[PDB]
Amino acid sequence: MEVIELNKATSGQSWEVILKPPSDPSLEEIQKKLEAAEERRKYQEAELLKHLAE
């Protein structure tokens, strides 16, 4: 069982212990999707208001 990289400090201590060895969208796209949803909502509200006026 190996012990490596023994790091010491004032409020701690650390080491590794080997038991065995081995074997994004831009702001433009964000507003595009945020506007398309608002426009899908706005269409649904106006279609309702159209039906209510009927």
């Binding site: 509200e45 309702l48 208001l49 209510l52 006026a53």
Partner: protein, 427 residues
Amino acid sequence: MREIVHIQAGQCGNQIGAKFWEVISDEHGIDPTGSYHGDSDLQLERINVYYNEATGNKYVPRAILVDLEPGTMDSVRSGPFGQIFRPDNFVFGQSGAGNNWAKGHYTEGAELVDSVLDVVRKESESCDCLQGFQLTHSLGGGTGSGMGTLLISKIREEYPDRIMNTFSVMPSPKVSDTVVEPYNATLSVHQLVENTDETYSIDNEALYDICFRTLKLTTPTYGDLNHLVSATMSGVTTCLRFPGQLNADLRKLAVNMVPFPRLHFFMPGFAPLTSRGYRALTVPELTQQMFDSKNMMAACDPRHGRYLTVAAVFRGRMSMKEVDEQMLNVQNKNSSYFVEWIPNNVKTAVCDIPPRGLKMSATFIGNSTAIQELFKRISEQFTAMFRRKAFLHWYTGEGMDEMEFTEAESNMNDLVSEYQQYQDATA
């Protein structure tokens, strides 16, 4: 989301609407003058949901009283709490609707409707954040039925983004003898399916049978029925009036209760069932009772259908462990009556303040497919008259056509077909 605007239309609406304010006023420690005189500050934390605070720290209900006749509203004004209500908020006519949906919706109601909306508008202004609307009414009359649904439609046009919720009273031939009631009720359901977010199906058949068979009242009165309605209304609104996690607003309630937009008709339940004249109930008793057919406010057998969603509210000082134990026991003992394709569809709330004269109660709210039974009933009665076009002259004499009736008939039959769809649906 914060403030709820309450509207009460017609004889039934104003009677049950009145009893509602009397019950929750006492609950929130508000006297018939509007002055607060309570023992807990839990009573005021969410007071502004239903009450407008006025100069001199007096609380005014955010209530609009509508009718096409002065009668009931005059007795409400003469009543114990009539003094609490804003007098500018009493909007009435002199004609009457004569138990005619066509009169309430198109002819007589048409003449009064804008004066109501001006009061709705004024109330909506004094709102930091309006949640939506609450309406009390019967579906069997003319005013609450015809005018109530026209008011919902008009409110929806001006406030399309807000939540519309109703306490709708369903007709029964055990309570009423007005032949035209199935017609008015079918015309009103068609409207409710399209324009409401949540409807508490309060059935006069179930209220009558509870009074007769369980409360052993030989000759039940409207006040006897209304006693069960005011208990149900106090229970189903608890989460909106008192601090809490579950269903604390109209929208959160709708998202938990409405899987499909037309399937928003709730079967309310209540335990213990009482008459207006000691012995506390255990958490296991409250749970057996609230889910029992005999405790349902709609004349449907829940065991004939499946629950799509359930909300359970426990009021008083009890064990949250035992509430949880019994709620899980009910679900685990009868798992076939709860759709498998809506996981964890039963949500529970516990509120420390009980109702008046009860140490502990339980209110159930169920979106069961068994509500189709109530709709099949009104449909059986409607079709029997409509296939012979009987009593239609009362409606056509107001400008309506047979088409509106055929359409209403179809929509309700389609709604019954939808409830069956999800009763026979498997995962």
